[PDB]
């Protein structure tokens, strides 16, 4: 792991001591070689997690997400040109190095034994993302978006620190194993209720749940493509990762005290899939898709079945890939026509002809394509929640119907029926765009072949 951290340090002065028109190839090639050495991590077996350099350990809750970050970095590094090529050398190098430092605090977050180290690297994940979206947002409410963003994520995640410190000096250390192997069951007085509500409320902020969700879509639609993809995929699935870790304590009360969040989550899932049925601004639909999936993930973590945890981590990885890709398609359409609205750019089956193949493929992976990883995750979540209660399946299936409906609406309204024939600036699609389509939809199909890699540690 420290051999995976230290070349990400040394990759940072690469962009600094490389001259102009030469930085690009260097950063691409070297971060891809880091991605190979990243996929070399997968040694995990059987009995234990692989634990070393005492701060570090890897589950299979952490191995696939860590490979997801260390593979989604160079994809993004390639993805974020044509909107800052005409910017200056200094701000270009600063942008790239800020992304690299964002990756470093992400990997520090994902290999955190000690939960205080986890919280420090958590808000360390926060702080560059604001600078990215606020400096290169390329819209006019990005300022308010970043402000809402930081105050929601901090003020939700702030008392989590106090609760973890209370754990640190009422029990002993915060190794995750010594959090395990020692955890005494805590009874149902009111202070235990507040401590559980503190930790769960911090990560409810981060996912988001339904009641705290306007945090996200402004921050998605007013961001550059790099910040939007890292934000959506890596940050929300990081919140889920952290909840999967911290739920090992406070077991014998969360049954009693974890009802109303299920109701808020399911009704918010239906309302979110309904609100993304009728909006304009194509960019926003994928944000509300993300909120729908994360509400389903929250149901999956509040129930405590191994079926639920395997479906949870699969849903995390699959929707990270899918929503990141479909953000990239939205950015490609917006760089074709500088609109950000939807109904202006109709047509696009005729022109950009094999762009239609990638809209089809991304939207069917959003559809729960019948061997896709998205379907596997949603299916095992539905199985586990049916075992939780025999009546929840109406909301799950109604979610499925509306999810298919807005996916198909996005398909056949943005990219179907008639070119509006007053446009005359859309080019043929470049090779870079099709390269990014390929770099998104090869790993999803390879994971569709052999998926037993990425299911949870409750295997």
């Amino acid at each position: 792991m420290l051999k995976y951290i230290i070349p990400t340090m040394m990759l940072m002065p690469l962009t600094w001591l490389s001259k102009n028109s030469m930085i690009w190839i260097n950063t691409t090639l070297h971060s891809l070689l880091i991605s190979l050495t990243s996929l070399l991590l997968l040694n995990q077996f059987g009995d234990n997690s692989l634990n070393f350099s005492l701060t570090f350990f890897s589950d299979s809750l952490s191995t696939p997400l860590l490979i997801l970050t260390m593979w989604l970095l160079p994809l993004m590094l390639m993805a974020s040109q044509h909107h800052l090529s005409k910017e200056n050398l200094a701000r270009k190098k600063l942008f790239i190095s800020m992304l690299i430092l964002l990756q470093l605090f992400l990997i520090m977050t994902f290999t955190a034994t000690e939960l205080i180290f986890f919280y420090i690297m958590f808000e360390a994940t926060l702080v560059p993302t604001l600078i990215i979206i606020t400096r290169w947002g390329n819209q006019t409410e990005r300022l308010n978006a970043g402000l809402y963003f930081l105050f929601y994520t901090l003020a939700g995640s702030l008392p989590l620190l106090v609760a973890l410190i209370y754990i640190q000096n009422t029990m002993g250390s915060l190794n995750f194993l010594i959090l395990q192997y020692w955890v005494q069951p805590m009874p149902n007085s009111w202070s235990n209720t507040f401590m559980w509500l503190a930790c769960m409320m911090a990560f409810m902020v981060k996912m988001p749940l339904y009641g705290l969700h306007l945090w996200l879509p402004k921050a998605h639609v007013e961001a550059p493509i790099a910040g939007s993809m890292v934000l959506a995929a890596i940050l929300l699935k990081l919140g889920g990762y952290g909840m999967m870790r911290i739920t090992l304590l406070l077991n014998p009360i969360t049954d009693f005290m974890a009802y109303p969040f299920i109701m808020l989550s399911l009704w918010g899932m239906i309302m979110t899939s309904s609100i993304c049925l009728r909006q304009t601004d194509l960019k926003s639909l994928i944000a509300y898709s993300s909120v729908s999936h994360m509400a389903l993930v929250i149901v999956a973590i509040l129930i405590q079945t191994p079926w639920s945890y395997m479906g949870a981590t699969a849903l995390m990885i699959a929707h990270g890939l899918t929503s990141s890709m479909l953000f990239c398609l939205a950015n490609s359409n917006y760089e074709r026509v500088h609109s950000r609205t939807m109904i202006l750019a109709r047509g696009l089956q005729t022109l950009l002809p094999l762009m239609a193949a990638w809209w089809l493929l991304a939207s069917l992976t959003n559809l729960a394509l019948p061997p896709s990883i998205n379907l596997i995750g949603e299916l095992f979540v539905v199985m586990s929640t049916f075992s939780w209660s025999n009546i929840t399946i109406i909301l799950m299936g109604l979610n499925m119907v509306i999810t298919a409906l807005y996916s198909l609406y996005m398909l056949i309204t943005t990219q179907r029926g008639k070119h509006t024939h007053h446009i005359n600036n859309i080019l043929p699609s470049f090779t870079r765009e099709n390269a990014l389509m390929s770099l998104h939809m090869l790993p999803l199909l390879l994971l569709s072949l052999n998926p037993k890699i990425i299911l949870g540690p409750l295997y």
């Binding site: 200094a90 402000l147 702030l158 008392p159 620190l161 209370y166």
Partner: protein, 347 residues
Amino acid sequence: MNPIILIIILMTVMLGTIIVMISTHWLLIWIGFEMNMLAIIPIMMKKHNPRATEASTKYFLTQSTASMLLMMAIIINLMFSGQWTVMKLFNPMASMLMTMALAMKLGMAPFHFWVPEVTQGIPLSSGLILLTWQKLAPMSVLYQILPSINLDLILTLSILSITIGGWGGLNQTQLRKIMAYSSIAHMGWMTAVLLYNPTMTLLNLIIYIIMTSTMFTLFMANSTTTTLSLSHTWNKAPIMTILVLITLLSMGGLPPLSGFMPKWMIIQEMTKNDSIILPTLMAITALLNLYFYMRLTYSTALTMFPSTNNMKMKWQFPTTKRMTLLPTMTVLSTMLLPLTPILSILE
């Protein structure tokens, strides 16, 4: 002024603080505070505008009545158990007036009205020396009289100072009142820990002094009073932008950055007691004061304002002050997260 005269006067401000730090006799403490006042007045009114005259007048009245109330506390102490040892007092009344003397001295929310008034109407050098030294020296006094304090004093003054220094600051566009409101906020953080483990408070003192010296050197990069002047500092220099970014967020205190070490260890050795509602309330108001830092950041280093010609005329010339000690204090004030085991450097 002569440079001889200013080196003498700065030597006497230093001498007053060293006498306060060094003595074991209460009259020496009182003479130290007085001499510190006497010398710190003509650092103000380096110019001669009526702003400085009124500001030094207000500061003089509040500071002198604080010093005489401190002498009242000493004289009550010797109306009771009679010896000149700087130690535990022997009256809750004497401790009460002594804490209120310091609360008028260095600024707490019942007693804080003079601080933004006096910090606006002066140049930045006088504000620098007053904030740093005048908030350094009486913390030594509190560290010497910690065993005999009614905790309701420090609790009330600390909580109320955090929330007043928070809520003031949403409206002020002047830089100096922003910095004084930040000062009262850190006085709350530096005072509420005191009856628990004072090594935290003295480390917080060193942190706050290093941060505020960085901030006033960056506002002495060119003489700026509003935020608009800082947008023009963007247009004339690129690296002052990124340093205002990093040091403003370190005044905000985010965990990858070194302004989080005051919050973090204090919450730790605050909640190895079982005060929990008080730390979490303090940390919520600590989230509150970060907003005006954030709107200053959004004003200058992140967005870009429209600007003015003759900055074309300013491009040729160097910004050729000497920065007093800028780089050392910058990267010692911001990158110092992974050295929180330098807490125990202190005792």
